[PDB]
């Protein structure tokens, strides 16, 4: 459950480790976010030696809710936090190394390059 302040995390290699969601890049007054919405988050912290730097507005693909998303197949799934990756201003993530599993939530979004890298699926 994300909003324009919801501090959230990442599980990538690229640079940033923490940002802050600004918007959801959808129905603009929705704001609520589960595994699928699009946060234009403002970067907050990164690694002092590399590319992509603290405080640049970035678009972002969303995963990991903390209140399990209601599965179609009867079930219900969530992770240990609230987090994911960036999308860039020409589609896709500026990343390349996932840490830990994902869900087929993402698979239902149709973004496979992420899922092929995905070690465990739920």
């Amino acid at each position: 459950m994300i909003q324009p302040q919801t501090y959230l995390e990442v599980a990538d290699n690229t640079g940033a480790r923490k940002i802050m969601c600004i918007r959801v890049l959808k129905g603009s007054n929705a704001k609520y976010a589960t595994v699928g919405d699009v946060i234009v988050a403002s970067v907050k912290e990164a690694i002092p030696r590399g590319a992509v730097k603290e405080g640049d507005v970035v678009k972002a693909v969303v995963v990991r809710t903390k209140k399990e998303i209601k599965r179609p197949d009867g079930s219900a799934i969530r992770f240990d936090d609230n987090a994911a990756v960036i999308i860039n201003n020409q589609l896709e993530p500026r990343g390349t190394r996932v840490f830990g599993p994902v869900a087929r939530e993402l698979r239902e979004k149709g973004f496979m390059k992420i899922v092929s890298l995905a070690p465990e699926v739920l």
């Binding site: 399990e68 599965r71 079930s75 219900a76 799934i77 992770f79 240990d80 599993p101």
Partner: peptide
């Protein structure tokens, strides 16, 4: 607990 962190999942007894 999947490598990175841990995972939670609700399953029902009767089919899938």
């Amino acid at each position: 607990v999947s490598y990175g962190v841990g995972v939670e999942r609700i399953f029902p007894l009767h089919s899938p």
